[PDB]
Symmetry: C3
Subunit: 202 residues, 3 copies
């Protein structure tokens, strides 16, 4: 019951895409079932993941049942400049400067980007390198996320700050304990109205 998570366009609105089957080809990306992208101009969500180079070995992980709005970009580590001195990339220009290519160990590595489960990322958000966004978070439209966001927080702005906890700490801990997104789908299917009103916690 419900849609086929392996369909790229599950709604017979071609804007709405399931991201897992699109991004499965991608090295160093892991994406959960049912998470979707609402395309801005028809682009597929793989075009929204920028500067992701296997040699840098940074990973992107997105959980299940995420909602990603149009124009969201995810910036991986590939646009980092060397920063222990001049940021000018002499190496890029050749003509003898190519001898000054940075070693891998001289490039900033800001870490992996990990977006949890049941996360809603609003329109035109930018997620910068090395960010972790906890389960159940909401990131407001047009946010620029540079630091981690805790579970079940509403966050917004540029740079994105935590605005408030969505629910009481206790409800949050219970939701984090039960992880409904990892239930068998036939069990999710029996309980969507309760997942939608938080009465799953009891």
């Amino acid at each position: 019951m419900g849609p086929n998570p392996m369909k790229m366009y599950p709604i017979e609105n071609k804007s709405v895409q399931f991201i897992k089957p699109i991004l499965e080809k991608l090295e160093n990306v892991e994406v959960g079932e049912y998470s979707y992208y609402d395309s801005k101009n028809g682009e597929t969500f793989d075009k929204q993941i920028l500067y992701h180079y296997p040699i840098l070995n940074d990973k992107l992980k997105i959980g299940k049942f995420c909602s990603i709005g149009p124009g969201v970009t995810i910036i991986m580590n590939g646009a980092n400049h060397r920063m222990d001195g001049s940021t000018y990339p002499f190496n890029l220009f050749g003509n003898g400067w190519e001898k000054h290519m940075p070693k891998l160990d001289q490039l900033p590595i800001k870490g992996d980007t990990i977006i949890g489960n049941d996360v809603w990322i609003g329109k035109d958000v930018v997620i910068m390198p090395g960010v972790k966004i906890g389960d159940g978070a909401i990131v407001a439209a047009n946010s620029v996320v540079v630091k981690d966001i805790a579970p079940y927080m509403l966050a917004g702005g540029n740079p994105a700050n935590e605005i408030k906890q969505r629910f009481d700490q206790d409800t949050i801990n219970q939701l984090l304990d039960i992880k409904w997104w990892n239930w068998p789908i036939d069990i999710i299917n029996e309980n969507i109205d309760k997942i939608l009103d938080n009465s799953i916690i009891r």
Copy 2:
């Protein structure tokens, strides 16, 4: 004197600049004041800039008179909201049995109408988020993302936008808010534009 406010493209040889009223005229739940203009980024008409505006949610957009709206400004109405009392995942969108989980109107966030006042200047690429009110005479800086209301004759900027300063002293603002020159017939405004432009109109 001046152009006819019902002319969609009032400036001979600059078709970027649109009077919004005659363009927005076709739109349900949108009211827009005379002389307010949009300066198009790439020729798009301003209706394309009003997003997620769905008649079923019954939220209204109101924009006053004599507003200046820069290129790329978007106005986000309540249609982007997710249900929020539990999971934000919109199961219902996907059908195949999930549509039984459609939220009722009263389970969705209702952030309110969007009301932009008179004589407001909204800069390039500003985003106006649902439910916000912006008072008469305000200035919103380019690239702002406005989530909270902005008071009359305030300069605001940032993402999220914050009030930076009052443009004028409170007494002046109070007087401007009393006189409401923007409500005068244009043939009365026409005699007074110089005093409107330098604030001596309160005298």
Copy 3:
């Protein structure tokens, strides 16, 4: 040794990487240093990214040497300012009699010149607003909207952009600003790039 700073496309067959000086040399009231480059978003040349820059307003844009400008960066000069001692509504633009209310140059906000120093990295999709100074060695985070000055060798980010941290301890900063490697003869630069890249140039 090294590339030709007078080529608009210093790498043969690559129209993404652009030297900004040769491109903007034709422009009045712009001064740009050698080797500063733009990394194009979609193949647009950097002159397209300089907005609202009108000779008659007499504001200058200056960019130093060895700057890295990321894709989609825009620089906003003074030509989008509105008159704001009273109504911001630009009656004059619409003619039909209202062109008599054109603001004199000295009635418009003059926010000043925009000056970007040497060895500055401006990240993707930054907006630089009017009248801003950015010091040597600064890094401006992607998506920043820069409304106030940024001191030399500071990391800055946000909208509005704030200083986040000094890149290096003050003694290191002071020495770098003393020696100004970017003003050395290119033959000297070439012999020392490895030291410039690790800051051991100061020792």
